[PDB]
Amino acid sequence: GAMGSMERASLIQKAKLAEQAERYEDMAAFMKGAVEKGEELSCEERNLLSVAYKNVVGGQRAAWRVLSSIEQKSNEEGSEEKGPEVREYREKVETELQGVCDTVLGLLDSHLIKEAGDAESRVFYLKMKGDYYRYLAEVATGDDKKRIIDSARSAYQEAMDISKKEMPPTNPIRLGLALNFSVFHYEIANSPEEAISLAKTTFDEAMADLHTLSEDSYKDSTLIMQLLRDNLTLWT
Amino acid sequence: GAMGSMERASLIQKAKLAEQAERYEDMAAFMKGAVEKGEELSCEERNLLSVAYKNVVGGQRAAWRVLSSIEQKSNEEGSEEKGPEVREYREKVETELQGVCDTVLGLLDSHLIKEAGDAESRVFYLKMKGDYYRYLAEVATGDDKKRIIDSARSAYQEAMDISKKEMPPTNPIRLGLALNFSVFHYEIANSPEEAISLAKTTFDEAMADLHTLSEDSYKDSTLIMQLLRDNLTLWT
Amino acid sequence: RDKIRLNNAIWRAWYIQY
Amino acid sequence: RDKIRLNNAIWRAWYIQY
Ligand SMILES: O=C(COc1ccccc1P(=O)(O)O)NCC(F)(F)c1cccc(F)c1
Ligand SMILES: O=C(COc1ccccc1P(=O)(O)O)NCC(F)(F)c1cccc(F)c1
Ligand SMILES: [Mg+2]
Ligand SMILES: [Mg+2]
Ligand SMILES: [Mg+2]
Ligand SMILES: [Mg+2]
Ligand SMILES: [Mg+2]
Ligand SMILES: [Mg+2]
C-alpha cells in the first residue's frame, strides 16, 4: 500500500504521534502498514493496533447511533418524513463502518492469528475478531447477520477456552475478553442471563485470585473489574 | 463532484445531520455540494458552511500544534533526534490543512463573494477569506507567507470598511470580524498594539451602542463581546 | 478512569433504551 | 458558553507561549 516504502520502526513511531494528536484514522493506517511487514507485534504494538481501530469504529458507531435515533423519532409514520435523506446518510456511515471492520478482520486473518505464538497473543487477536464481528452484527440483517453472530461467538469462545487454560483470572486480556463476550451475550446474542452469569463469574474469580495481578498491568485489571460491576449494575 | 446529482435541499439537510453526528468532513462536503448549485446561501446556510470548515481546519490545526510542540521539545539538538519522522508527519498534516484552506478559498472566489447581495453577506465571506488565509499563514514560509499575509489583511480590511458603514456596532458578524482581525494583528502581522487597540475599540463601541442588538442574535453578540474582553485580559 | 466508566455506562445504556 | 470561552483562551495562549 501507501505504507510499503516506510520503515517498520517509523510506522510504529508515527502511529504513536497520531495517537497523541488523536488522529485515529492515520494511527490505524500506520499500524496496518506495520502489520503488513509480516513480523509479530509486541504487547505494546498490539495495543496501538487495537486503540487505533477501536477509536475509528467507535466514532462511526456513535455517528450511526445519532442518525439511527434521529431516524426513529421521525420514522413512526403519520407525521412528517423528510424523504430518504436520514436513511441514505445512515447507510453511508454503515458502509464505511463495514469497510473498516472488513479491514481489521482481514489483517487478523491475513495474518495476525496465523503467526501468533504467545497464548496471550492468540487470545488478544481472537478477542479482536469477536469484537469486529460484533460491530458488524449491530448493523447487519438477515442471513448475513446470522453468519456474523456465529463468527463472533466462535472467536470469543475459543479465546475464552485458551484464556481459562493459560492466563491468571486477573489478566487484563482475559478480563477484557470476558467483559466484551458478556456484552455480546447481552446486546447481540439476546442472552441477558448468560451475559450476567459470565460478568459475575469473571468478577468473583478475579476477586478470589486477586493476589495474581502483576506490577505491570494491575491498573488495567482493576478498571475492567470495575467495568464488569458497572454493567452488572445496569443489567440487574 | 460526488454531490452533483443530489438535490440542494437534501444536501443542506444532510449537512445538518452531519453537524449533529459531529462528522465535520461530511458536513463540509455536503455544503460544498450546496454552494456548487450556484444559488445564494441564506444566513442559516452560510453558518452551516462556516461551522463545517472551521471545525475541519480546527482539527488539523490542533494536530499540527501537537506535532509542532513534540517536534520542538526534541529539535533542540545535542540530545536524541529520532530521525525525520516528526517533521514528516507534521508536513503531511500541513499539506492536508493547505488543501482544505485552498478549497474554501476557491468556493469563496468561485463564487460566493461574486454573487453576494447583502452587506451582511459580503462581510461574512470577506471575513471567511481573511480567516482561511490566516490559517495558511500560521504554517507558511518565505515569499508565499508574505503573499498570504497581504491577502488576509486585504480581505479583513475591506470587510471592516463595509461593516463600519453598514452594520450596527453590536452586529455579531461585525463583532466576529473585528475579533478575528484583531487576532490576525496579534498572531500573524506581529502588531500586538494594533490588536489590543482594535479589540478595545470594538468592545467599547459595542457597549456604547448596546441598545442595538437584536432579538435574533444578541446571544451571539454578547459571547463575542466576552471573547474580546478575554483576549484583552490575555494580551495585557 | 471515571470518564472511561461514564462513557461505558452511556454506551451500554443506549442499547437498553433503544 | 464557558466551554467556548476556555477553549478560546487555551488556543490564544498557545501562541503567546510557543
Ligand atoms: O466504553 C465502552 C463503550 O463501548 C465502546 C466504545 C467505543 C469502542 C468500543 C466499545 P465496546 O462495544 O467494544 O465496549 N466500552 C468499554 C471499553 F472502552 F471498550 C473498554 C474496555 C476495557 C477496558 C477499558 F478501559 C475500556
Ligand atoms: O476558540 C477559538 C480558538 O481559535 C479557533 C479554534 C478553532 C477554529 C478557529 C479558531 P480562530 O483562530 O478562527 O479563532 N476561537 C474563537 C471562535 F471559536 F472562533 C469563536 C468566534 C466567535 C464566536 C464564537 F462563539 C467562537
Ligand atoms: Mg525490512
Ligand atoms: Mg448499508
Ligand atoms: Mg471454566
Ligand atoms: Mg435544480
Ligand atoms: Mg509542508
Ligand atoms: Mg472607523
Q: Which residues, 6+ apart, have CB-to-CB distance to B170 below 8 Å?
A: B206, B209, B210, B212, B213, B218, B221, B225
Whole-angstrom Cα distance, residue B187 to residue B175? 18
| Nearest ligand to residue B227 Cα | 2
**Nearest residue to A4 via CA among A41, A28, A21, A29:** A29
Mutant choice from B30, B89, B96 vs A, greatest count of A C-beta within 10 A: B89
Angle CA(A42)–CA(A45)–CA(A46) in degrees, nearest 5? 85
The superfamily in CATH containing domain A8-235 is 14-3-3 domain (1.20.190.20)
d(CA D7, CA B50): 18
* CA gap A35, A49 in Å, rounded: 9
Number of other CB atoms surrounding residue B146 within 10 Å? 12
For residues B164 and B156, is the Cβ–Cβ distance under 8 A?
Answer: no
Residue linked to cell 536524541: B80
Whether the CB of B223 is below 8 Å from some CB of chain D: the reply is yes
Rounded to an integer, what distance in angstroms lies between the CA atom of residue B29 and that of residue B3?
8
Is residue B63 less than 8 Å (CB to CB) from chain A? Answer: yes
Resolution expressed in Å: 2.0
What amino acid occupies position C3? K
Alpha carbon of B3 to ligand 2 centroid (Å): 28
Number of other residues whose CB lies within 10 A of the CB of residue A31: 27
Residue A185: closest CA among A196, A201, A200: A196
What's the CA-to-centroid distance between A177 and ligand 4, angstroms? 28
Helix pair B218-235, B172-187: axis angle to 10 deg: 20
- Which of A7, A16, A88, A89 would you mutate first to test chain B, the one with the most B CBs within 10 A? A89
Cβ count within 10 A of residue B142: 7
CB < 8 Å from B in window 1-18 of D? 1, 4-5, 8-9, 12-16, 18
Chains C and D touch (3+ CB pairs under 8 A): no
Q: How many residues does chain D have?
A: 18
Torsion of CA A101, A105, A107, A112, to 10 degrees: 140
Does chain A touch chain B (at least 3 C-beta pairs within 8 Å)? yes
Angle at which helices A85-107 and A43-71 cross, to 10°: 160
CB of A30 closer than 8 Å to CB of A36: no
What does the domain layout of chain A look like in residue ranges?
A: 8-235
CA distances from residue B23 to A62, A64, A89, A101, A188 in whole angstroms, order as listed: 10, 11, 11, 19, 26
Distance CA B1, CA B205 (A): 45
The structure's method of determination equals X-ray
